[PDB]
Structure formats: C-alpha cells, structure tokens
Design a protein around this nucleic acid. Structure first.
Length: 73
RNA sequence: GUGUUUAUAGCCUUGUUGUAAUACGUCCACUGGGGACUGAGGACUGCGGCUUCGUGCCAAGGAUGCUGACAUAAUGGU
C-alpha cells in the first residue's frame, strides 16, 4: 500500500520561513487593555504576557470575572 | 492741526554682527506604520545573500504556517 499509486504531484519547495510575530509597542505586559470581541466584549483586562501571536490576558477574577485567557492582538 | 528727525515710539535704506535658519527643487541601492486585491507554478537544478565550511540557513526561478467553527449544519445552486 506504500508505493505511490498516482502521479504524486509533490509540492515544490516553498521558501516560507516562520518568524516571530512583531506585536505593537503599546501591547506591553501589564498594560490595561479593552477586549473587543468574544463573550467578554467590553471588559478591561490586564495583559500578563505575550504568546507567539496572542496576548495571555486576564482581568483579576475577583474584579471582572475574566479568567486566564488568550486574546488575539 | 503746522513743522519735526528718536526724544519718553520707532520706520525705511545702507553697509554690516557669529553664522545661519527656513521654504522650495532634487536625490538616498535611508527608514517606520495602516489598507486592499492576488497565491499562478508544483521533487531537484538557476541567479544571489548570509555562512570558517556546512545532505547549513535565507524574504534568492509564484503561500505557507498556527488555529477555530459543522453533518439532524455549514456553504452554494435553482
């Protein structure tokens, strides 16, 4: 079952490399930020740290009830 | 109101105080963001750049990667 049974149009070597996301200078860790979409739209939450593209964000769960969540920048 | 010549304002002209600054024109193989449309091709060759050299890496002969939602729905057609 292993030998290719068809033309096997193997994709050409694509010269695309993964590089780190350049987030905005204003999305530093610790800055208060307003959520725009999702079930928690309109809430204000604190940016703990930046993931590769998203921001690991949370409002103090005793304050606005927004748990440890990810948010797209 | 008449005539004045810095008076208790100063104006213009002239050379002139250390030089300038700015605007406009032009150029940078200088640089930082925002938006939109496209992804044709399909092993490898090539031209280049990094790299002490690299079955090396790269934005260099055309898009890839990471995710999320749905079968009783989603999406489109008539």
């Amino acid at each position: 079952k292993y030998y290719p049974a068809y033309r096997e149009n193997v994709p050409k070597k694509a010269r695309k490399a993964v590089r780190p996301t350049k987030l905005r200078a204003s999305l530093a860790p610790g800055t208060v930020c307003i959520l725009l979409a999702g079930r928690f739209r309109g809430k204000r939450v604190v940016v703990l740290s930046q993931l590769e593209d998203t921001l690991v964000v949370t409002g103090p769960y005793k304050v606005n009830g927004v748990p440890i969540r990810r948010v797209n920048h």
